[PDB]
Amino acid sequence: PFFDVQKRLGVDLDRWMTIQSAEQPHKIPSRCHAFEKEWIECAHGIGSIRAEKECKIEFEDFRECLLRQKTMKRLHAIRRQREKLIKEGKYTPPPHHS
Amino acid sequence: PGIVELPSLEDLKVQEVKVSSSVLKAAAHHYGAQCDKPNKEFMLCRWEEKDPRRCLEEGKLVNQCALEFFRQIKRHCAEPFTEYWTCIDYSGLQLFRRCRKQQAQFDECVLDKL
Amino acid sequence: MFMINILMLIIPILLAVAFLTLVERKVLGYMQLRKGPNVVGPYGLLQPIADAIKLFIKEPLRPATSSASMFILAPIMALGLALTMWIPLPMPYPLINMNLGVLFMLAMSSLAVYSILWSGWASNSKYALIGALRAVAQTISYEVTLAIILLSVLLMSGSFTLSTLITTQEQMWLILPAWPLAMMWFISTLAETNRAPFDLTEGESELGFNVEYAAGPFALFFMAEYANIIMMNIFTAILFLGTSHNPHMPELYTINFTIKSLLLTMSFLWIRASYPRFRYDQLMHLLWKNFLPLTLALCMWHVSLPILTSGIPPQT
Amino acid sequence: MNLMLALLTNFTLATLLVIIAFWLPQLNVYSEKTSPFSMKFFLVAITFLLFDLEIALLLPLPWASQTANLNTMLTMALFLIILLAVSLAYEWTQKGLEWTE
Amino acid sequence: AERVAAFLKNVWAKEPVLVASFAIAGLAVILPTLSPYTKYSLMINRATPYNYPVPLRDDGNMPDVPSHPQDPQGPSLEWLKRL
Amino acid sequence: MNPIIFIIILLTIMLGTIIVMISSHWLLVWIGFEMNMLAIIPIMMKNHNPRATEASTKYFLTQSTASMLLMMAVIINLMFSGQWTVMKLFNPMASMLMTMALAMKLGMAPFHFWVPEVTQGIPLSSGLILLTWQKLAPMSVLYQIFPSINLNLILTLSVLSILIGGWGGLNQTQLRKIMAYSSIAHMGWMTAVLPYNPTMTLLNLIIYIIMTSTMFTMFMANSTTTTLSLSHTWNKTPIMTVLILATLLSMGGLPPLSGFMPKWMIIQEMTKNNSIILPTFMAITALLNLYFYMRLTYSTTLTMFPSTNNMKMKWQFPLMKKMTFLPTMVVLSTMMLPLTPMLSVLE
Amino acid sequence: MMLYIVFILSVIFVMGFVGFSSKPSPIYGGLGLIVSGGVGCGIVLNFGGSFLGLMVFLIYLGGMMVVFGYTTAMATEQNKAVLGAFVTGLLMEFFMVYYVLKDKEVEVVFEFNGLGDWVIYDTGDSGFFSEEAMGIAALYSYGTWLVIVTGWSLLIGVVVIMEITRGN
Amino acid sequence: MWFEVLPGIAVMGVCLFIPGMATARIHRFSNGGKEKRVAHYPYQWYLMERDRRVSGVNRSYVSKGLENID
Amino acid sequence: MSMVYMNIMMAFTVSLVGLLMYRSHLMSSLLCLEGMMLSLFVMAALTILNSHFTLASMMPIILLVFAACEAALGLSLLVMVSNTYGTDYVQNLNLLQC
Ligand SMILES: CCCCCCCCCCCCCCCCCC(=O)OC[C@H](COP(=O)([O-])OCC[N+](C)(C)C)OC(=O)CCCCCCCCCCCCCCCCC
Ligand SMILES: CCCCCCCCCCCCCCCCCC(=O)OC[C@H](COP(=O)(O)OCCN)OC(=O)CCCCCCCCCCCCCCCCC
């Protein structure tokens, strides 16, 4: 904050909803609780200049759990390959996939 | 990156407990007071390992106790129990308070026989 | 079978609305020392059927509306929403078992104002617009008390599920612990449905918005309006006059629940015959200066009363 | 799917009655017939909107009573309702709820 | 003593609705503080088990944690059965 | 307006700006802005005439649009990082909208066309709030997200503001429009040094507020809103013309007055980063500001313009305006250069 | 075709926006914004948000939009540009739909995918409550600061609007 | 007399009884003589889907008891 | 991102362009302003619900409450503009050029 009144007074005005790995009612976790925790604990205390380089591995995993971009590319590839072999008589789906 | 390791289709096979949710919900209270030890070991495994592949052997033990638990009901208290979960199964919400009369018979039967 | 279920709900609703017109004309007649329809069929049992055929073979006006597309949208929306407000009603088993059914009925009920507003535009008459604005201001004003009163009652129930209100009243009617709220809920339902003593629209000598409609289109507004009168009185009985439900004999619930729903619908006809009409500025003051102060105060009381007695209902 | 069919049936039925209502009498052939902004109304709508929004913050009260912080929850619940009553008092005393010119 | 009676008896005659509204709202703010059962509301809310009671690995020095649900150690809901 | 309601509305303008400065959550930052815009419109409509109504409308549309863009940046930032904390944004597209939303609120060029017109259509006291207080909230957010702001975007908005503020001011006779263009010109300096040393952004902001508040206070004392009406001051309050001369010279950056300190320190923090072309171009373009400031000094203090006969009736009454903190503000606007090293208190 | 209900609703969502964005008469513009609102709730409902979806009907459609239509009928005095904009909007929507349905990958500022929205849903849930409802109910236990600022803003809205509309 | 108003009430009363009576009977017909299952929360839905797999026939309302356990 | 986000993200763009190109009526633009908040409401709710960000489930409601309060303030200005020039045309609001 521009003014750190919350830290000076020790009052939690709006820090309870900043991150999704904080305390949630009934201990309900977010889908990416583990990834957010890992990135936060990696980058804690070392400033954002260093964290952009020394915690890049954790951050990419966190962003993969958020938008799932890499996974959808992989599933998309498999679907195309199966579709290509499907319209050539070269593939046979098993009974439990149909 | 790496390759996700998965157990084999023969490492997951086990004798299932094929009884409807009404049967489970009728025996839930007695079930939890008899199979607590194998149950809690499996749950401690899951909340600590955080990986279902690490607690498969504990999982099979949970299944075996449930199968053995229901066989004892199958031997001594079958008609009282079959008449208990039939009333539970009738309500859309599967309410306990609608079947107090049938619960007492099943509760008393297990007390004497087991 | 679900499609059969929908038709088993829609057609009986329309038939009930058809014969409510007869019953209204005869109860009003006997309270006025006369009879009402007793010539068209035995005891006027064919009067509703004659009225329906007559309207649907009478030429409609359809004036030079500014749009001619709102003129056809307004009755579709009114009748379409009126039938939709019945699908979550437990009688005793809902057609659609919603988790937030009580909130669904508020949401759909607040959309019925558009048919009042759109028909005002379509008429193309400047004066007919003024009548539509007064009706709209009445409806939105009195659904402030519907929302707060409903919230106060649900604090003793624990959920927005409509079938949970049946469980809540398994030992005693909610009319007993919450009769002050029931009074202001009952009057708030009259104002919502433009019923006497709150019918300024139909109250000639001051204005209605559906004046340019005749024949079939007029009957569509009429049918929707009366289906809402039955629906709101069914809602009231569920809310404040809970009927005990025996899972083995569900018909027992339906008979008792129907009798209550009829007695509350006849109360609407009873109140029409007994009182004069409110002035526009006077029904607004009845809401913003009398009901709202009490509704807000009772809401505070009902948020705290369960806590200080250790009587908070279960979430599920 | 069930809720989708229910909505489709009700509005489809209403449309049918409307169109056959505008056409059934037109199967008949009748001879062709031939031939100010108000401020108080606006303030009612705006007062309803601000009151309606405050109701949105009160709807989750039944679930809010299930918490383990009833002292905090009951303090804010009575704060919102008290503030809603303060708005009513301000309009009442400032002649907002009047219909006389 | 006489000023208040004159004031109260006048609003009660001219504005009975407002007099009722403030009395009801005033009780909603006061009684919870003085009510002896407000503490049981929190205990009931804390007793409701939405989540699973994850067990604790045994180290040997935990005499207050039961080894089985039916052991006498641990929190008891006896007070609730009698309330 | 009732006096009590006037205090309540003002405290809500302050509360909105304070919420922005004490919040670690983007939602509360957005709420802070919304509470600020809601409270400031009534003080712009207070005189109840068509021009005020038009000014309040042009302000609402501009600030409403800016707030929607800001909230779009927050949501995009939530999708790509899964958090709400008020810090560097984690998506370049979020940064652009966030940087452009704040630029619209500030009034930087080319999102500047409303500042001359809104400031002209509202009273002097409302303009003082608009040009000084309303600039604190957007600058607080820029102070915090500057590590991720696009350099070419922030420096491009800064250069246009300096130019457009300069040329726009030359063709003005209305005092309210002259300050508006003066406000656009000084914004460019604050955002030009932001990537390099945010401390000098605050110093230039603090000095600008003090100087701008002094000018509006002196205009309000004599109820002057046009260049000509200001030229009668020498015949009514001679002292007030000497104070206007000193402040106008200060705002132009002429040493040894206070207004030279920020221009001095900003040029220092940019040459350390091997930025030589930009500070020179910025400093030379600022001579446009000094010109139309000097024009007011010729028609106010350094020459005696024609007077009117009825002026003699004014000599018999005193000044009953409040003129709050005017003696203290005028001294801080002129005699603070020897205390330049005190800027370290802002670090 | 029922597995792509969310995408179908989103397509109707956009078409409504092109409706009132082209700015026909205010009467029709508000009509198009009601359709988009209803479709907007439909999308939110299918993602698990029931309270949020219904809050759109009660507060947005049955609230604000009624005030918009109410104010239009009383202060609005009941072209090529409209048609040109409307046709331009539909064409861009068609091409965006056409490409994302052909190669199932489109890059416009962001990298969008075309597999289907269902592929990102969570695969595990056995709670005895609604996670959405629990969060909203936390407004009273966790959001003390939020309640105060929101309530004060609503109270100031009443004061400010009466000041603006007095006219004297 | 006043009792000549009743016949209209009976018809209106019967029409409000059919929707309630029909839904109760149709549910039992379609759910093998039991009430339709109520699934408001995810846990109840999980059990119902599990019952679908345990029935053999892909129907949630066909209950398998101890006779299905070895 | 995903397929649904494209249309929600493209609906915000349409409303933004609609708000930046006035035709004649002031009421028309306010609708484009309330269309923008509807798209932001849906886009945020999709993100929060999908990620099981429990405590953020209240954020979309706060977005709706403030955006409607702002809309009310917008309509009030429109009314006061119409009571002066007899219509809500933006071309009338051109006194401040000089
Ligand atoms: C221990 C804690 C206890 C806490 C709770 C204590 C509660 C104590 C009692 C509080 C008062 C009870 C509230 C009653 C409602 C008062 C509303 C009100 O505003 O009254 C004044 C209002 C108007 O008062 P007024 O017009 O005479 O004057 C108001 C004040 N002055 C004089 C300044 C203007 O009365 C009305 O509502 C008018 C009624 C309109 C016509 C309605 C027809 C009635 C037909 C009979 C229906 C019977 C009910 C059916 C219910 C069936 C339900 C299933
Ligand atoms: C600690 C947490 C709670 C904190 C709550 C604090 C906020 C309270 C919010 C209340 C809602 C806002 C209402 C405020 C307006 C009060 C009424 C008013 O505006 O005054 C108008 C009235 C006009 O006077 P006039 O009409 O000329 O003559 C007759 C008047 N009786 O002038 C008057 O004479 C009215 C007199 C003043 C009204 C006082 C109301 C006091 C209410 C408290 C009662 C509590 C009692 C509870 C105990 C009950 C026990 C049975």
Contacting chains of G (3 CB pairs or more, <8 Å) are A, C, D, E, F, H, I
In a domain? residue D98: no
Surface-to-core class of residue F29, CB atoms within 10 Å of its CB (0-12 exposed, 13-18 middle, 19+ buried): buried
Domain total of chain D: 1
Ligand nearest to the CA of C197: 1
Please state, in angstroms and rounded to a whole number, the distance separating the CA atoms of residues C274 and E47: 54
In a domain? residue D100: no
Q: Sign of dihedral through CA atoms A50, A52, A53, A57?
A: positive
Q: Which of B31, B40, B41, B50 to mutate to test the interface with E (most CBs of E within 10 A)?
A: B40
Question: CA-based diameter of chain A, in Å?
Answer: 72
Q: Is the Cβ atom of C69 under 6 angstroms away from ligand 1?
A: no
Q: Is the Cβ atom of E20 under 6 angstroms away from ligand 1?
A: yes
Contacting chains of D (3 CB pairs or more, <8 Å) are C, E, G, I
Q: Which residue in B32, B33, B44 is closest to E55 by CB distance?
A: B44
Mutate which of C156, C181, C187 for ligand 1 pocket (most atoms within 8 A of beta carbon): C187
Please state, in angstroms and rounded to a whole number, the distance separating the CA atoms of residues C279 and C283: 6
DSSP states of F121-171: SS-HHHHHHHHHGGGHHHHHHHHHHGGGS-HHHHHHHHHHHHHHHHHHHHT
Q: Sign of dihedral through CA atoms H42, H45, H51, H56?
A: negative
- The enclosing H or E element of F33 equals helix F26-44
Residues of A in contact with E50 (CB under 8 A): 26
Whether G27 and C67 lie within 8 Å, measured CB to CB? yes
Please state, in angstroms and rounded to a whole number, the distance separating the CA atoms of residues A42 and A59: 9
CA distances for G127 relative to A91, B56, F297, G131, angstroms: 40, 23, 75, 8
In this structure, which amino acid lies at residue D64? A
- The enclosing H or E element of I11 equals helix I3-19
Please state, in angstroms and rounded to a whole number, the distance separating the CA atoms of residues C1 and F127: 70
Domain total of chain H: 1
All residues at 6 or more sequence positions from E11 whose CB lies less than 8 Å from its CB, including other chains:
E18, E19
Gap from CA of C302 to ligand 2 centroid (Å):
21
First to last CA, chain H: 72
DSSP states of C111-133: TTHHHHHHHHHHT--HHHHHHHH
Burial C196-220 (b: 16+ CB within 10 A, else e): bbbbbbebeeebbbbbbbbbbbbbb
- In F, minimum Cα distance to I98 occurs at F117
The answer to whether chain A touches chain F by having 3 or more C-beta pairs less than 8 angstroms apart is: yes
Burial G110-147 (b: 16+ CB within 10 A, else e): bebbbbbbeebeeeeeeebbbbbbbbbbbbbbbbbbbb
All residues at 6 or more sequence positions from G110 whose CB lies less than 8 Å from its CB, including other chains:
F93, I1, I5, I9
Please state, in angstroms and rounded to a whole number, the distance separating the CA atoms of residues I83 and I85: 6
Please state, in angstroms and rounded to a whole number, the distance separating the CA atoms of residues B24 and F194: 67
Ligand nearest to the CA of C175: 1
Whether H69 and B91 lie within 8 Å, measured CB to CB? no
The answer to whether residue G111 neighbours chain A at the CB level (below 8 Å) is: yes
Please state, in angstroms and rounded to a whole number, the distance separating the CA atoms of residues H41 and C316: 9
Asked if residues C174 and C242 have their Cβ atoms less than 8 Å apart, the reply is yes
In this structure, which amino acid lies at residue C179? W
In this structure, which amino acid lies at residue I13? T
The candidate with the shortest Cα–Cα distance to D54, out of C144, C107, F30, is C144
Residues of B in contact with E69 (CB under 8 A): 32-33, 36
Q: What CATH number has the domain spanning G4-162?
A: 1.20.120.1200
Domain that holds residue H30: 1-70
Please state, in angstroms and rounded to a whole number, the distance separating the CA atoms of residues G166 and D39: 9
The candidate with the shortest Cα–Cα distance to C292, out of C205, C184, C192, C218, is C184
| B93 DSSP 8-state letter | T
The candidate with the shortest Cα–Cα distance to C157, out of C57, C88, C239, is C239
Asked if residues F103 and F149 have their Cβ atoms less than 8 Å apart, the reply is no
The answer to whether residue I79 neighbours chain F at the CB level (below 8 Å) is: no
The candidate with the shortest Cα–Cα distance to I93, out of I26, I30, I28, is I26
Residues of D in contact with I83 (CB under 8 A): 37, 39
The answer to whether residue B36 neighbours chain E at the CB level (below 8 Å) is: yes
Q: Is the Cβ atom of C271 under 6 angstroms away from ligand 1?
A: yes
Cα dihedral A43, A46, A47, A48 in deg (nearest 10): -40
User: Which tokens hold the place of F151?
Assistant: 């350099």
Nearest CA to ligand 1 atom 6: E24
- The enclosing H or E element of G112 equals strand G110-113
Q: Sign of dihedral through CA atoms C33, C36, C39, C44?
A: negative
Asked if residues I29 and I22 have their Cβ atoms less than 8 Å apart, the reply is yes
The candidate with the shortest Cα–Cα distance to I41, out of F56, D56, G157, is D56
Residue C20: how many other CB atoms lie within 10 Å: 26
Q: Which residue ranges have their beta carbon within 6 Å of ligand 2? A: D 82, 85-86, 89, 93; E 11, 22-23, 26-27, 29
Cβ under 8 Å to E: C residues 267-296: 289-290, 293-294, 296
What three-state secondary structure class fits A19?
A: strand
All residues at 6 or more sequence positions from G134 whose CB lies less than 8 Å from its CB, including other chains:
A25, A26, A28, D63, I54, I57
The answer to whether residue E40 neighbours chain C at the CB level (below 8 Å) is: yes
All residues at 6 or more sequence positions from B65 whose CB lies less than 8 Å from its CB, including other chains:
B34, B35, B38, B39
Gap from CA of B28 to ligand 2 centroid (Å):
57
Please state, in angstroms and rounded to a whole number, the distance separating the CA atoms of residues A83 and I51: 31
Write down the residue that tokens 């001594």 correspond to. B76
The counts of H helices and E strands in chain H are 2, 0
All residues at 6 or more sequence positions from E22 whose CB lies less than 8 Å from its CB, including other chains:
C297
Domains of chain I: 3-85 (1.10.287.3510)
Asked if residues F247 and F211 have their Cβ atoms less than 8 Å apart, the reply is yes
| G63 DSSP 8-state letter | I
The candidate with the shortest Cα–Cα distance to F259, out of F319, F330, F313, is F330
**C205 CA to centre of own chain:** 25
Nearest CA to ligand 1 atom 3: E24
Asked if residues F37 and F63 have their Cβ atoms less than 8 Å apart, the reply is yes
Helix axes F92-106, F136-145, angle to 10 degrees: 160
Gyration radius (Cα) of chain A, Å: 22
- The answer to whether the bond into F318 is cis (omega within 30° of 0) is no
Asked if residues I17 and F65 have their Cβ atoms less than 8 Å apart, the reply is no
Please state, in angstroms and rounded to a whole number, the distance separating the CA atoms of residues F343 and C268: 77
Asked if residues H24 and C93 have their Cβ atoms less than 8 Å apart, the reply is yes
- In G, minimum Cα distance to E49 occurs at G128
Give CB contacts under 8 A, 24+ apart, made by F268-271. Answer: F269/F193, F269/F196, F269/F197, F269/F200, F270/F192, F270/F193, F270/F196
Cα dihedral E26, E28, E30, E32 in deg (nearest 10): 180
Whether D66 and C312 lie within 8 Å, measured CB to CB? yes
- In C, minimum Cα distance to D80 occurs at C300
The answer to whether residue C106 neighbours chain G at the CB level (below 8 Å) is: yes
Residues of G in contact with E50 (CB under 8 A): 127-129
User: Which tokens hold the place of C256?
Assistant: 């008792």
User: Which tokens hold the place of A54?
Assistant: 């020394």
Q: Sign of dihedral through CA atoms F280, F285, F290, F295?
A: positive
Please state, in angstroms and rounded to a whole number, the distance separating the CA atoms of residues G20 and G30: 7
The candidate with the shortest Cα–Cα distance to G72, out of G108, G31, G103, is G31
**E44 CA to centre of own chain:** 8
Residue B100: how many other CB atoms lie within 10 Å: 9
The answer to whether residue I4 neighbours chain F at the CB level (below 8 Å) is: no
The candidate with the shortest Cα–Cα distance to G152, out of D57, F111, C226, C235, is D57
Asked if residues F122 and A37 have their Cβ atoms less than 8 Å apart, the reply is no
The counts of H helices and E strands in chain I are 3, 0
Residue G111, φ and ψ in degrees, nearest 5: -90, 105
- In G, minimum Cα distance to H43 occurs at G126
Residues of C in contact with H36 (CB under 8 A): 93, 97
Residues of G in contact with H42 (CB under 8 A): 125-128
Q: Is the Cβ atom of C291 under 6 angstroms away from ligand 1?
A: yes
Asked if residues B86 and B62 have their Cβ atoms less than 8 Å apart, the reply is no
- The enclosing H or E element of C1 equals none
Asked if residues F55 and I96 have their Cβ atoms less than 8 Å apart, the reply is yes
Please state, in angstroms and rounded to a whole number, the distance separating the CA atoms of residues H16 and C258: 6
Kindly list the domain boundaries of chain G, sorted by start residue.
4-162
In a domain? residue D35: yes
**I56 CA to centre of own chain:** 22
Nearest CA to ligand 1 atom 7: C180
Residue B45, φ and ψ in degrees, nearest 5: -65, -40
Q: Which of C85, C100, C150 to mutate to test the interface with G (most CBs of G within 10 A)?
A: C100
Surface-to-core class of residue D3, CB atoms within 10 Å of its CB (0-12 exposed, 13-18 middle, 19+ buried): middle
What three-state secondary structure class fits D33?
A: coil
Contacting chains of B (3 CB pairs or more, <8 Å) are C, E, H
Domain that holds residue D57: 7-93
| D69 DSSP 8-state letter | -
Burial F105-115 (b: 16+ CB within 10 A, else e): bbbbbebbebb
Write down the residue that tokens 């033990």 correspond to. B61
Q: Sign of dihedral through CA atoms F116, F122, F125, F126?
A: negative
Strand partners, F174: F226
Residue H56: how many other CB atoms lie within 10 Å: 11
Least Cα separation, residue A19 to chain F (angstroms): 5
Gyration radius (Cα) of chain G, Å: 21
Q: Tell me, in Å, the resolution of the deposited structure.
A: 2.6
Residue C113, φ and ψ in degrees, nearest 5: -70, -25
Atom nearest to C285 CA in ligand 1? 34
Please state, in angstroms and rounded to a whole number, the distance separating the CA atoms of residues E31 and E24: 11
Atom nearest to E26 CA in ligand 2? 47
In this structure, which amino acid lies at residue C171? Q
Please state, in angstroms and rounded to a whole number, the distance separating the CA atoms of residues C60 and C130: 23
With residues binned 3-state (H G I as helix, E B as strand, rest as coil), the percentages for chain A, rounded to 5, are 60, 0, 40
Please state, in angstroms and rounded to a whole number, the distance separating the CA atoms of residues D64 and F52: 45
Residue E75: how many other CB atoms lie within 10 Å: 8
Helix axes C101-109, C126-154, angle to 10 degrees: 170
**D12 CA to centre of own chain:** 24
What three-state secondary structure class fits F306?
A: coil
- In G, minimum Cα distance to D51 occurs at G154
**How many CA atoms lie within 13 Å of C149's alpha carbon, on the beta-carbon side?**
29
CA distances for B58 relative to B12, B14, B44, angstroms: 12, 12, 10
The answer to whether residue G74 neighbours chain C at the CB level (below 8 Å) is: yes
Ligand nearest to the CA of C184: 1
- Structure obtained using: cryo-EM
